[PDB]
Design a protein around this ligand. Structure first.
Ligand SMILES: CCCCCCCCCCCCCCCC(=O)OC[C@H](COP(=O)(O)OCCN)OC(=O)CCCCCCCCCCCCCCC
Ligand SMILES: CCCCCCCCCCCCCCCC(=O)O
Ligand SMILES: CCCCCCCCCCCCCCCC(=O)O
Ligand SMILES: CCCCCCC
Lengths: 65, 64
């Protein structure tokens, strides 16, 4: 049965991940963005004021892909 | 009977997914990127229900 369960779980995973992608795409499009890399210090503000950081949101996209 | 309440369980997974879209459609209409105007009201739910019901009503009238 394990092959059947894997077959269900793969399509299930794409469907939930694809819902999450749509939610993230709306959430990123509606908001203002800031971009940074691994050379960040311990904690500091970025050049624009009041922006929201979502780089882990799109790094999770790469990792899941 | 227990079977009757038991049968309708299968609908809870695919219904949630519907709400999963319903939020994603409202958020863009929320205009949160620009400074939101206060105490102004607007809606899209009626648009959604008429979209979901009108083709069904048209088909039912055709059947009639
Ligand atoms: C298309 C027709 C079939 C699909 C739709 C019907 C099936 C989904 C809805 C039925 C209700 C069941 C709810 C889960 C059971 C439960 O509630 O058991 C209760 C336990 C407790 O949960 P917990 O560990 O989180 O502890 C609580 C922590 N808060 O669950 C579990 O231990 C996890 C195991 C989940 C069930 C595994 C099998 C389900 C996947 C296969 C079914 C789909 C395809 C079937 C093959 C074609
Ligand atoms: C809440 C845990 C599961 C997460 C949501 C599972 C996906 C919902 C069902 C997939 C979308 C609808 C297609 C199946 C049709 C149905 O039986 O309702
Ligand atoms: C589609 C699955 C994602 C979850 C969204 C569907 C159910 C919404 C529940 C979370 C928001 C409602 C609870 C917090 C807001 C409130 O208290 O009214
Ligand atoms: C977790 C079980 C989901 C049932 C619906 C799959 C399409």
């Amino acid at each position: 049965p394990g092959f059947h369960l894997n077959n269900l779980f793969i399509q299930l995973s794409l469907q939930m991940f694809m819902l999450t992608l749509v939610n993230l795409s709306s959430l990123a499009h509606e908001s203002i963005m800031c971009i940074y890399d691994r050379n960040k210090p311990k904690t500091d503000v970025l050049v624009p004021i009041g922006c929201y950081n979502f780089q882990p949101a799109v790094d999770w996209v790469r990792r899941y892909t | 009977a227990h079977r009757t309440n038991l049968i309708m369980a299968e609908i809870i997974p695919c219904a949630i997914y519907a709400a999963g879209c319903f939020i994603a459609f409202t958020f863009i209409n929320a205009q949160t990127g620009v400074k939101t105007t206060d105490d102004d009201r607007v809606n899209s739910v009626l648009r959604i229900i008429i979209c979901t019901l009108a083709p069904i009503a048209v088909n039912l009238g055709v059947l009639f």
